[PDB]
Structure 1
Amino acid sequence: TGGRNSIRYSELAPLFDTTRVYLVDNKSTDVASLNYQNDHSNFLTTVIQNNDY
């Protein structure tokens, strides 16, 4: 553990030890732009849940 934890993201600061990333389809911004031609059994998701990008 010691120095081996650090879970980092762009400038948003150091998070330490387990956290949570989310894989979701119903995410509104995504639909419109990425998986238009796809379906629920094979889609793309933005795992970055940051409102500004």
Structure 2
Amino acid sequence: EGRNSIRYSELSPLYDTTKLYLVDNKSADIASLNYQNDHSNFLTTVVQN
């Protein structure tokens, strides 16, 4: 208790477990981040907002 918080920068804090997703076919990332790379060396966002 107390030492179990998970804080994003402006939103309600969670506590003691969550999930994180690392998918490879989000449109905004296709457009900007990933132009010269492939499905084995890619770059993705962990923020879903």
- Of all paired residues, the percent bearing the same amino acid is 84
Gaps of 5+ in 2: none
**Over 3 Å off, 4+ runs:** none
The 3-state SS of whatever aligns with 1:30 is helix
Q: Secondary structure at the match of 1:29?
A: helix
Q: TM-score when scaled to structure 1?
A: 0.85
TM-score normalized by the length of structure 2: 0.91
Q: Report the Cα distance in structure 2 between the residues aligned to 1:29 and 1:4, rounded to whole angstroms.
A: 35
Alignment length, in residue pairs? 49
Distance 1:45 1:35 in 2: 8
Q: 1:7-35, CA deviations, whole angstroms, 9 ceiling, x for partnerless residues?
A: 01011110111101110101111110001
Which structure carries more strand by proportion?
2
Whole-angstrom distance in 1 between the partners of 2:42 and 2:9: 25
